[PDB]
Amino acid sequence: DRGVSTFSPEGRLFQVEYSLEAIKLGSTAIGIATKEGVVLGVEKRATSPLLESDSIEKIVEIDRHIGCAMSGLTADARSMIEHARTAAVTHNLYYDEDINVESLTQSVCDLALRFGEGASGEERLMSRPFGVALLIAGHDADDGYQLFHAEPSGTFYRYNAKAIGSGSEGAQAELLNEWHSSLTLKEAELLVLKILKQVMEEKLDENNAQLSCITKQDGFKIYDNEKTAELIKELKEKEAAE
Amino acid sequence: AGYDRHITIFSPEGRLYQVEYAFKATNQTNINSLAVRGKDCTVVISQKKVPDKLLDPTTVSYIFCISRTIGMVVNGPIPDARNAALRAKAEAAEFRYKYGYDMPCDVLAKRMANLSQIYTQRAYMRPLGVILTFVSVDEELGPSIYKTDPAGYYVGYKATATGPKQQEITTNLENHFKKSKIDHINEESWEKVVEFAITHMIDALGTEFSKNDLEVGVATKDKFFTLSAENIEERLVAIAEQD
Amino acid sequence: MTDRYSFSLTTFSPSGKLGQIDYALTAVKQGVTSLGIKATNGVVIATEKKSSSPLAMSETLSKVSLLTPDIGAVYSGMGPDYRVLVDKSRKVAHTSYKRIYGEYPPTKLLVSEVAKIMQEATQSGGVRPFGVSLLIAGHDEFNGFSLYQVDPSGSYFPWKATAIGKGSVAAKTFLEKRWNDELELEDAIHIALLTLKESVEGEFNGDTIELAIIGDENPDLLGYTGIPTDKGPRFRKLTSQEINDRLEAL
Amino acid sequence: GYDRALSIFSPDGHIFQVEYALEAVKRGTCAVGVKGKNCVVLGCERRSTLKLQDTRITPSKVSKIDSHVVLSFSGLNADSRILIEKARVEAQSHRLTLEDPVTVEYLTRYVAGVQQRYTQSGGVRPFGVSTLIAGFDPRDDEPKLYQTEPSGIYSSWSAQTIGRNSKTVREFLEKNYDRKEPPATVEECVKLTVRSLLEVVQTGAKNIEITVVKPDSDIVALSSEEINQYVTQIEQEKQEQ
Amino acid sequence: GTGYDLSNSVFSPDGRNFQVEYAVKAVENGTTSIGIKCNDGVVFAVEKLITSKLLVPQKNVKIQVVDRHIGCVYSGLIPDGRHLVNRGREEAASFKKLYKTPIPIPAFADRLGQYVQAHTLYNSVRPFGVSTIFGGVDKNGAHLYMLEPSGSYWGYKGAATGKGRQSAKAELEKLVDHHPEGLSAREAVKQAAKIIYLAHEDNKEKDFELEISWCSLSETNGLHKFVKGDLLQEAIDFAQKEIN
Amino acid sequence: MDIILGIRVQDSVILASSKAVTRGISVLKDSDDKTRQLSPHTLMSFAGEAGDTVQFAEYIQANIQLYSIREDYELSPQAVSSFVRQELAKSIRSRRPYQVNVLIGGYDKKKNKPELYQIDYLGTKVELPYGAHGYSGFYTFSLLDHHYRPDMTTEEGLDLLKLCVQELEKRMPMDFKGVIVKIVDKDGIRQVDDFQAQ
Amino acid sequence: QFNPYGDNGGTILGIAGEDFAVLAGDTRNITDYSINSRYEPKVFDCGDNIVMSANGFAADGDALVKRFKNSVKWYHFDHNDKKLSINSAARNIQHLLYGKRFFPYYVHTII
Amino acid sequence: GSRRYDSRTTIFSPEGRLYQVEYALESISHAGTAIGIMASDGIVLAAERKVTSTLLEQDTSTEKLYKLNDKIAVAVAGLTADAEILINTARIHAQNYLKTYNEDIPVEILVRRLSDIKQGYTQHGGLRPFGVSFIYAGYDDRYGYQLYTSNPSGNYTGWKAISVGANTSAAQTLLQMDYKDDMKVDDAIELALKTLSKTTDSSALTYDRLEFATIRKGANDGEVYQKIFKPQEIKDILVKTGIT
Amino acid sequence: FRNNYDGDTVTFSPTGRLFQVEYALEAIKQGSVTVGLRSNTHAVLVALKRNADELSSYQKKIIKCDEHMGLSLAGLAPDARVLSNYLRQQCNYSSLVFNRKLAVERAGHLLCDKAQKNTQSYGGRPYGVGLLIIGYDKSGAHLLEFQPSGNVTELYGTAIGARSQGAKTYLERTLDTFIKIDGNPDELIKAGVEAISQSLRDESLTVDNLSIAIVGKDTPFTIYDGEAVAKYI
């Protein structure tokens, strides 16, 4: 066949590029940063009404000041999260301090290219790249509120707002306009809820959608259905308001 | 399916093409050689062709001294020849160390033959494109010639020839023995056995040789050595004064 | 470097055939004929010494090998493969038996060990099956005389008499006609020589024929005297002279 | 030694070996599970390609992982054993180190983990198996029902089915199961289960097996008769109309 | 059939190993370099194409030393060359460690030979994309060698490899004839500078930089050294003169 | 060492184990249960090295529980005791051997007979009417050798046991803070929570 | 037999003020009753306003200080030249030391 | 690299099937037929020797019935050599169990392990599966006489009566036609010979082409006994059941 | 043709080429332009940072490997991290074991040899990144150009990435002038900025888009970004 770590004539790694395709099919995930905190929202997307929607975990806590949302082959993200949590915890054990959000991100990205069938450079054991992207949101004393997009390519970017998943391209264009450096957490919450609503096949309710945020004071928290339902309602009213 | 021609696995006819092609490469050098057994010595002749003028003729050889007693001439590309030579030398040293006596020519031949047999069965090892002729004067078997090939095959000979024109040299020798009725050259001195060798090499190939057209090795009781251009010239001058 | 051929080179084809084993068998058919005949007081294995050159020395290359002092082997197919199998067989007879029980293994078991080695070459990663079939004849105290055939697949079966190689079909038929459960060793050696004659084209003499037997114990071949219970090997390769003397009464 | 990447991405972003692993599941005998108000029931169908078996000794479809949790599956049987053995061992290990039996969700997350790992590890093919894991967490009375697939993904269901015709029996369940009012009785829960299986088993009293799980390690498998009875009472519901 | 050229250790029906042959192609496409064996040492020279004014002059040195008495120069894939020299350095180090005596040139030659030949035995490796000219002085005088991607090597009176290998061989052969008694170290240096200038015609497009080193019993005390300063400029002149 | 006694009567096996846990100069606990249940009808008592003791017992337990689930069956007492001997026999030639002595009391639901197994840290296994590890036998064996009878009743046993515990309280130098008694019979394992004055 | 440890003497002192801190030490290095040097610095500036001294067996003390300074170097690489707080340094050193819990750096270190 | 010649013996077809297992079975379908019939007081194993001759020594031949333990035997259908590898790891497994517990290994426990080994060559290692199918006839004090079957896939099941190898379709029909729960060993013995006699590709069903074994409980004892019939014993039973 | 020979680096084409390596080289061309140049007292790195959206940040192109050495990258960011991290260790090793600053020329050799290993062995892949290394050592200022093929070269100045040819010409043109900008770092930087702007097209160099690095005689390797580079735009 052809090695899993081969280059295309255009200078790209086949397996990584294809990896990106699988992610385009994933459920929508959106993150928005504001000087008041960072909001992280995702599209549950149950494959049947018999599926208890709350058993759908696509937003997880890495540390008290770091959480992330995933999109793509989500089973692949388990080891990623495990590594991430261990890194945050370990850094605390070794330095008596919280891990910087960027470092945590870099740490996760370092696993990314660790695949192959015998790549000369160390001992990269993992037959294929991960098929899932992550939005890592958190806060640290050095650069405050931050939002990161980490891909199977091993690269990561910092964003003020970012959307990944099936509805991404459209949602990103949206964010491109909607976002401005003076948004409040509440405004961010509604904006996420709004864009999710627009790109979701399903009618957004507090069962097929989920919100969460990270703030210096209370850290990373996942909004429970009730809290989100009201924000959804509050949104319908403001929209119909004009 | 058609890869049964790239690695050492069976073809539907039960053949190993890679082993067949390795044999093909043994003629790359376009050099012939022959070995004969004396009354108490063994001689190996090999053509020497150094066309490039920039080459140092003295560093061009296909005859090796595996040990004080064993000599080896190779028909095939030089890098595989040297690989086989190095290995044999190691095998011979090791054998002496472990068993307390000089490794016999036939045993070294078998050991190398077995090593080749493996490249024939294991997929990642390619056969070596060479045929090895081991010679010596065994302390038990006397004058000896054992030759091995890319197939892992090997056997002892009364005399033997190898190369593009191996057949001509062989039938020449076959004839000589059918006549003499003995399995060796009834000659006391090796100088004369060397002359016999060169003479028949000439008859068989229908070619005359100068002192730089040949390479000669001689094995006697407790010593294998190779002749110099001069040692050869003397040999050549000798055959001249008979024709 | 490092063998990266950790996968099987012999696999099942959609029709259920194991290609490499088949091909290996083909190679065996192309091989020189070799046979074996079991008598009441011995066994005999024989083959032709297809000298690959008149300058070669047929004696320096034996196709009939002693495995233990009461077991011999002969083959058809790839000579080099047989040579290493013979070494492995002689070794396994020690490491897996004589070094444990202090006695040489019984024919069936050694045969079984050999077969295993071949079976593995049919499934292990990065190798090809052995291109040979063997005929092992031996004798052990509790099983008397026996004759076995081992194939490239690793299968083996006991025989009263059989042949493998080039003219196996014809030879097997000739043997079926001449074999009976009352043959004495001399009778089997005779029938052996007759059977081999049909398969041979040119010269047929003690120098072109290789034949060994498993019969009585040869105290005279033991090498030492003084131990009553030790009586000598049952395996004995016939001499060129012995073969010729018999060819006269052929 | 052997580490060839057998599960890799193709142009469209798929991992065919995992997808083909599901195909193996689709071909497997149907499995179903429904949670009541204080119990969970697991039903599985039995093939009939050949019948002259010894049901006493032939390995059954529902397996106990611990005294309080069970696992059924659809797909390759040989594969299921490996997952079941691993789960059982992990169960004892959890008790031994945390001094507390596994929660159903944990035992599920573990099995899903093993499956996922076999999709991005060299020299191995994914498990051709999907599972249904159910039971009650230690000192808890709220029934648990989870499902896992070759990809390594899992989640909980009020009721779910896997295997051949699982599309059919799922539809049945979607319009026969009310979360508002779950089968408040072991009997009415085992009935809904058999009803869903009959939609596909095609009259198979000896082709349908049931296992009931109640809080505090109360696990039991019904016998032909007990089940045959449910089949009976159900066939009348129809005729009586 | 075909495809006998896609895997490294495969014998084609005629007995060749195309991958090694393709390796040679990379060599032939490289800069020209040579070696001249004089009466008490050896001289190495090589063409350095000035790809642009931006290349700092005299800096990117090509010729490498092994131990203290051996010189190595090669044409083809440079990184492949360094790799082979690194091996040679280890090879020579271990030899000296056990035998005390610095490695004899002939012995060093076989070490490199066995190593390079080893890269034509398996399909899991690629053959070396360089031909190497190396040598030095030892207990028995001077020795000059050239190693091919196939692992083949012999002793030479003169040696050349690369783009202009033909010009050089023509020139080297002339020296051999017009000096049956031997060339001197001082002379070989000039003659080397000339042959490189002549060989630079099959590449006369880009401007080049000459590099020379030598190992002479009388001129360097057996140790390998680079020809620099005056003696260098001097040979550059002897060449620039005869090129017109 | 602690006290580990065992006596097999007519239809059950009784295990008595000291409750004291002493660490040098101080008695840290007086209600220690030196036993683990390997299966519904098999109980194992133990004494020996500080950490090894429980580590070994729990390791054995975990394994027997695993066998039970995999086979949906309860291994006979004899089988369980053989497994345990094998494990201790390995330990003896390992890098750091488990210094644990155990008594295995079980009721074979197939044979319908109670069984007592004594195994020391070397993997020395022997089946007995009654047994003990350490010095305990030195004060109690003479009593048991005398009054023990195969047809004894669980009540007679408990009485003969009470007799033994008294001798230990009279002649043994250390205060083992009494024993916890347990019975294994056809119906399972139960603790005689009233032996502090039975 | 071989004793991997030694004693080079020395005495160090650390006092913390309200808005400053000091770490002092004699500059004498010894072996038994001989003086190896009358001036061999023992207290070191490791950057980010952190001073450290590993007193006791000099070979080990140098190893430690060298290893810690290196840890600071990487801390800058990994965390964008972020300053290493005194508390973080202390925790890091605890790991450096305990990492050799069974063949310790025979030194009493103060920072 | 090597990837080029890797068959990939452990992957799913687009239909979710395992090629090699499928083909292995296709191979087994041409192997001499093996039958296992379980009565109430014993079990019967019967196999047809594929390919025989006048000279084939039958008294020393055993190509289909192997004793694994004193209470467990298996009938083989497929590659004999592959079978022996498995058979041996089985015999050892039995002894390990006995050594650990001092109790003979329960029949299913031995069957599940052997099946697990097969299953492995199905999921990892890149090797071909074992081209073998087994019929296990054994007895233990927990389930009494048992009859199991395993194939290359690694799956196993229990039966009252079953056949593997060639013409199973035909044999299975015939067995499902005359089997009865109340059968007695001798009834089962007769049913087995009859089934084989009707499914053979051979002319007649003679003893020299058969292997036979029974696991009964010799009433005059109280213990179970395995018996692999000898050539003359098969010859006798053949005459009695009326096949002469 | 090529299709049958570009599946790995352990295969030569009939013309002696190594496609996998060549493809790696392409990754660089597709990368963002970066320039390097030096006088006798300083070495400068100027790089054009690229961003994804206008909501994203600009990817860093300059990495410090030690107090006297650093590099700029074009190509696979991850690989730059692997390589620069390896270079940090080498600098570190030289200090700890020999109390010696690693020479730029030496570092170059180490990089070359490391890159080469992933172009002759099965399984590995060539690095897909180009590197410009500047440093000040015992022999002065230095600029090196690293290519995935293993080729490392010392130059007065150079540039890699898309449209790199622009600056490379300007530098090849200004050579005689900038090579003499000693003792005036700001001038050398301005020369570098002018060089890189010769490869612009899409936009113009802004404050959060320009990245400059410098090292020299008494100047530890330092990086400038944002407002820090303002006085040069």
Swiss-Prot record, chain A:
Pfam families tied to this protein: Proteasome, Proteasome_A_N
Superkingdom assignment: Eukaryota
Q: What else is known?
A: Present with 17100 molecules/cell in log phase SD medium.
One Gene Ontology cellular component annotation? proteasome storage granule
Its quaternary organisation is: The 26S proteasome consists of a 20S proteasome core and two 19S regulatory subunits. The 20S proteasome core is composed of 28 subunits that are arranged in four stacked rings, resulting in a barrel-shaped structure. The two end rings are each formed by seven alpha subunits, and the two central rings are each formed by seven beta subunits. The catalytic chamber with the active sites is on the inside of the barrel.
Protein name as it appears in the record: Proteasome subunit alpha type-5
| SUPFAM superfamilies the record matches | N-terminal nucleophile aminohydrolases (Ntn hydrolases)
Q: What does this protein do?
A: The proteasome degrades poly-ubiquitinated proteins in the cytoplasm and in the nucleus. It is essential for the regulated turnover of proteins and for the removal of misfolded proteins. The proteasome is a multicatalytic proteinase complex that is characterized by its ability to cleave peptides with Arg, Phe, Tyr, Leu, and Glu adjacent to the leaving group at neutral or slightly basic pH. It has an ATP-dependent proteolytic activity.
Which keywords has UniProt assigned to this entry? Cytoplasm, Nucleus, Phosphoprotein, Proteasome
| A biological-process GO annotation | proteasomal ubiquitin-independent protein catabolic process
Q: Which residues cross the membrane?
A: none
Q: Mind telling me which NCBIfam families this protein's record contains?
A: PRK03996.1
Name of encoding gene? PUP2
Phosphoserine found at: 48
Of which family is this protein a member? Belongs to the peptidase T1A family.
As for subcellular location, the record says:
Cytoplasm; Nucleus
Where on the chain is Phosphothreonine found, per UniProt? 47
UniProtKB/Swiss-Prot annotation, chain F:
Is Cell membrane given among the entry's keywords? no
Which of the residues bear the PTM Phosphoserine? 76
Q: Name one GO molecular function term.
A: endopeptidase activator activity
Alphabetical list of PROSITE patterns matching this protein: PROTEASOME_BETA_1 (PS00854), PROTEASOME_BETA_2 (PS51476)
What residues bear N-acetylmethionine in this entry?
1
Q: Name one Pfam family in it.
A: Proteasome
Keyword set, alphabetical order: Acetylation, Cytoplasm, Nucleus, Phosphoprotein, Proteasome
Where is the protein situated, by its record's location annotation? Cytoplasm; Nucleus
Q: Tell me one GO biological process term.
A: proteasome-mediated ubiquitin-dependent protein catabolic process
Q: Which domain of life is it from?
A: Eukaryota
Main localisation: cytoplasm
Would the keyword Calcium be found if you checked this record's keyword annotation?
no
Listed InterPro entries: Ntn_hydrolases_N, Proteasome_beta2, Proteasome_bsu_CS, Proteasome_sua/b, Proteasome_suB-type
Q: One GO cellular component from the entry? A: proteasome complex
**What is the similarity comment for this entry?**
Belongs to the peptidase T1B family.
Role of this protein: Non-catalytic component of the proteasome which degrades poly-ubiquitinated proteins in the cytoplasm and in the nucleus. It is essential for the regulated turnover of proteins and for the removal of misfolded proteins. The proteasome is a multicatalytic proteinase complex that is characterized by its ability to cleave peptides with Arg, Phe, Tyr, Leu, and Glu adjacent to the leaving group at neutral or slightly basic pH. It has an ATP-dependent proteolytic activity. This subunit has a chymotrypsin-like activity.
A further note on this protein reads: Present with 21800 molecules/cell in log phase SD medium.
Tell me which PANTHER family the record gives.
METALLOPROTEASE TLDD, PROTEASOME SUBUNIT BETA TYPE-1
Q: What is this protein called?
A: Proteasome subunit beta type-4
Swiss-Prot record, chain G:
Please state where this protein is localized: Cytoplasm; Nucleus
Q: Where is the signal peptide?
A: none
- Which branch of life, at top level? Eukaryota
Family per UniProt?
Belongs to the peptidase T1B family.
Subunit composition? Answer: The 26S proteasome consists of a 20S proteasome core and two 19S regulatory subunits. The 20S proteasome core is composed of 28 subunits that are arranged in four stacked rings, resulting in a barrel-shaped structure. The two end rings are each formed by seven alpha subunits, and the two central rings are each formed by seven beta subunits. The catalytic chamber with the active sites is on the inside of the barrel.
Q: Describe the task this protein carries out.
A: Non-catalytic component of the proteasome which degrades poly-ubiquitinated proteins in the cytoplasm and in the nucleus. It is essential for the regulated turnover of proteins and for the removal of misfolded proteins. The proteasome is a multicatalytic proteinase complex that is characterized by its ability to cleave peptides with Arg, Phe, Tyr, Leu, and Glu adjacent to the leaving group at neutral or slightly basic pH. It has an ATP-dependent proteolytic activity.
Which protein are we looking at? Proteasome subunit beta type-6
Name of the encoding gene: PRE7
Swiss-Prot record, chain I:
Q: Which residues form a coiled coil?
A: none
Which GO CC terms are listed, alphabetically?
nucleus; proteasome complex; proteasome core complex, alpha-subunit complex; proteasome storage granule
Which keywords accompany this UniProt record? Cytoplasm, Isopeptide bond, Nucleus, Phosphoprotein, Proteasome, Ubl conjugation
- Which InterPro entries does the annotation name? Ntn_hydrolases_N, Proteasome_alpha, Proteasome_alpha-type, Proteasome_asu_N, Proteasome_sua/b
Any GO BP: proteasome-mediated ubiquitin-dependent protein catabolic process
Task: State the compartments where it is located.
Answer: Cytoplasm; Nucleus
Q: Where is this cross-link: Glycyl lysine isopeptide (Lys-Gly) (interchain with G-Cter in ubiquitin)?
A: 190
SMART domains per the UniProt record, alphabetical: Proteasome_A_N
Question: tRNA processing among the record's keywords?
Answer: no
Residue(s) carrying Phosphoserine? 13
**Family per record:** Belongs to the peptidase T1A family.
Q: What else is known?
A: Present with 7210 molecules/cell in log phase SD medium.
Q: Which PANTHER family match?
A: PROTEASOME SUBUNIT ALPHA/BETA
Q: How does it assemble?
A: The 26S proteasome consists of a 20S proteasome core and two 19S regulatory subunits. The 20S proteasome core is composed of 28 subunits that are arranged in four stacked rings, resulting in a barrel-shaped structure. The two end rings are each formed by seven alpha subunits, and the two central rings are each formed by seven beta subunits. The catalytic chamber with the active sites is on the inside of the barrel.
Q: What is this protein called?
A: Proteasome subunit alpha type-6
Task: Give the lineage.
Answer: Eukaryota, Fungi, Dikarya, Ascomycota, Saccharomycotina
Encoded by which gene? PRE5
